[PDB]
Every structure is written in C-alpha cells, then in structure tokens.
Amino acid sequence: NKQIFVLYFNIFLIFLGIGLVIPVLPVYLKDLGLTGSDLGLLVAAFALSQMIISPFGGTLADKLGKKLIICIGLILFSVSEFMFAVGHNFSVLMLSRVIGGMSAGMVMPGVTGLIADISPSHQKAKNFGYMSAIINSGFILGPGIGGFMAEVSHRMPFYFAGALGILAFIMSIVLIHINWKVFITPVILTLVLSFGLSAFETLYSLYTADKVNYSPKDISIAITGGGIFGALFQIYFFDKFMKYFSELTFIAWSLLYSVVVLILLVFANDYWSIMLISFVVFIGFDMIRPAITNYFSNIARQGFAGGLNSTFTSMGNFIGPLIAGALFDVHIEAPIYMAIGVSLAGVVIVLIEKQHRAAAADLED
C-alpha cells in the first residue's frame, strides 16, 4: 500500500514548510527592512493559526470527509507557499503564514485519521511512530532544505515547496481512495521545551547572521548538523540513560546541559567554535522531548494527554519566537538570556515537583 507513503510525504511537507523561512529570515529582514519583531510575528502567526484551526479542522474532517480535506489542505498549503514566493509586503506575508498554519492544522488531523483508519490494528504504533518521526525531522530539516535551496535563489525554497505541494496534491488525488493538580507540571515542561526550541531556532538564524556574518548556507549546515546529531545521539543513548537515571532527574540534567551549552554559545565568537556549539546544542532538546512524552504517558485519558501536549507545544511555538524576535531588537544576546532563564525555570519546576513527590512519599509512611 503506497498510499501510506503519500500520507507520510504530506505529513513531512506540512511541517517542512514551517521551518523554510528560518534560514532565509535574515535575507528577508535585510531586503524589506523588517525588524526582528516582524519575523517573530510571522512564525508566531503560523503556529497560532495552526493551533486555532486544529480542533475546528478535526470536526470539519468529521463533517466533510477525509480525502477532500486532505486535498484542500494540500492545495491551501501550496497556494500559501506560492504567496510567500510571490508577495513582497508584510500583509501578504502574514496572510500566507496564516493560510499555511490553517493548512497545517487542517491536514494533520486528516492525515492522522486517514492513516489510522487505513492501517489495521496490527501496527497502529507505526501510524504514530514514523509519524512523530517525520514531524520533528521536518522541524529541523526545514532549514536544511531551505538554506541550500536559498543558494540558487532567494525565493527558490518557497517555489520548491510549492512544487512539492502540487506534486503531493496530485499524488493524493491519484492514489488514496479531571485533577489538573498533577497535570500542571508536564504541561509547564512542554511549554518550556517548545519555547526554548523555537526561540533558539529563531535566535540562531538572527544572531549568528548578525554577529559572525553567517551565510544562509552556513545557517542551514549548522541547523541540519545539530538536528542530525541530536537525533542520532537520542537514538543511540536514550534507552541506557533512562535505565540508569529517572524521569525527572534526567530532565533536570538535560536542561542543565542546555544551559551550559547556551552559555558556551554566548561566549563563542569563532566560526568553527560556533558551528560545533550548534552541533551540540540540539542534544538537550532532542533528549528532553521523548522524556516529556514518556512523563505525559505515565501520568495519563491518554488521548486527552496527547491533545494537551500538542496544544501546549503549539502554544510554545507561538509564544517563543514572537518574544525572541521582539527581544532581538533590544540586544542580539537578549534571547540567549531569555532561553537560559526559561531553562532555569524548568529546572526549578522539576526540582519543586521532585521535592513534592519526596514529601508525599515520606508522609505516606
């Protein structure tokens, strides 16, 4: 059944499109004279539109259909990409970002439901395994696709993504036919992790380009290498670390490592030192994400927990880049301090939760 491959490609491209403007962001800031607040607003608009449209998108899927919603979301994403590749003013860019977010929040529940329905109960894990695989991969391979495609032309990545959207649309047409007192901590951790990751993603593209004259190809190389190294390190060193450590102590240690590597980043000026720092930064976030997911699963109403995780991930992806773009104007190193403070708050929350657990255990006996 090759239709599963088409759905996988659609899920790949939908979350590919969010990170394509990340490496080209300095080029847009220089060309049209946009402030960092504008770029933060663009990425935040994408995330916010997706977050709003996701639930209404799922009923509409219930109301209208499954193939039709998939195709309409794909065509909306394609026209949003072409608008981004054609428009040259703030209003059209905002409209394209909003339409792309709507398309993302419309396809994602639709492709999820279609893949779940088509795949029999034997291997439903795949319907989510290769799923969360691709999403984050895209979330870090989007810049990798972007910056390299920026070498050919400034708007080349968006034309390429529009062509990919048209191809995916054609392929889809052809082929397919409650006590919150305990849940408060993992929600805060998800918000903190999403904030840190998205803020750092905007932070690197703006700050390295402003400081070390990083070309878009250099930013793409750094981000792709960091994401690949993080994924590889997680895959090859997560199970043993969970066996040796616990769920919360390991999260605290990984957030501390993220703080340390961010401090190394803020004190680095050389080209290759900064490249190595970008290589080693993503390990902390790429290792926190599965730990947070496991904590959410263990505490869990599993579907409700997953919905909360996704909703607060979107909330972080909306509230992080906006404040990062706003802060970059005041000081290019300010978002570094913001991310460090957010990670410190996450460590403090983890320590407080551990202390509360210890107190409850002691008082039990």
Residue 47: which residues within 8 A CB-CB, separation 6 or more? 18, 101, 198, 314, 317, 318, 321
Q: What is the DSSP string of 180-236?
A: HHHHHHHHHHHHHHHHHHHHHHHHHHHHHHHHH---HHHHHHHHHHHHHHHHHHHHH
Q: What is the DSSP string of 141-196?
A: HHHHHHHHHHHH-SSHHHHHHHHHHHHHHHHHHHH----HHHHHHHHHHHHHHHHH
Q: Are 18 and 104 in contact (CB under 8 A)?
A: yes
- How far apart CA 182 and CA 165 sit, in angstroms, is 42
**Of 199, 230, 192, 138, nearest to 313 (Cα)?**
192
Fold match flag (1-177 vs 179-365): yes
Structural domain boundaries of the chain?
1-177, 179-365
- How far apart CA 117 and CA 50 sit, in angstroms, is 23
- How far apart CA 124 and CA 136 sit, in angstroms, is 19
**Of 80, 109, 75, nearest to 95 (Cα)?**
80
CATH entry 1.20.1250.20 includes domain 179-365: yes
Burial class (CB in 10 A: 0-12, 13-18, 19+), 152: exposed
DSSP code of residue 89: S
Residue 298: which residues within 8 A CB-CB, separation 6 or more? 247
Q: Tell me which CATH homologous superfamily contains domain 1-177.
A: MFS general substrate transporter like domains (1.20.1250.20)
Q: Are 359 and 351 in contact (CB under 8 A)?
A: no
Burial string for 326-357 (b: 16+ CB within 10 Å, else e) reads: bbbeeebebbbebbbebbeebbebbeebbeee
**Of 260, 293, 289, nearest to 197 (Cα)?**
289
Burial class (CB in 10 A: 0-12, 13-18, 19+), 293: middle
Taking CA atoms, 269 is separated from 148, 257, 276, 277, 331, in Å, by 24, 20, 12, 11, 16
**Of 19, 42, 37, nearest to 334 (Cα)?**
37
**Which tokens in the block code for residue 312?**
């607060």
**Which tokens in the block code for residue 30?**
């220089």
**Of 350, 342, 291, nearest to 320 (Cα)?**
342
- How far apart CA 34 and CA 310 sit, in angstroms, is 30
Angle at 74 between CA 71 and CA 75, to 5 degrees: 85
DSSP code of residue 73: H
PDB experimental method: cryo-EM
**Which tokens in the block code for residue 294?**
């496991």
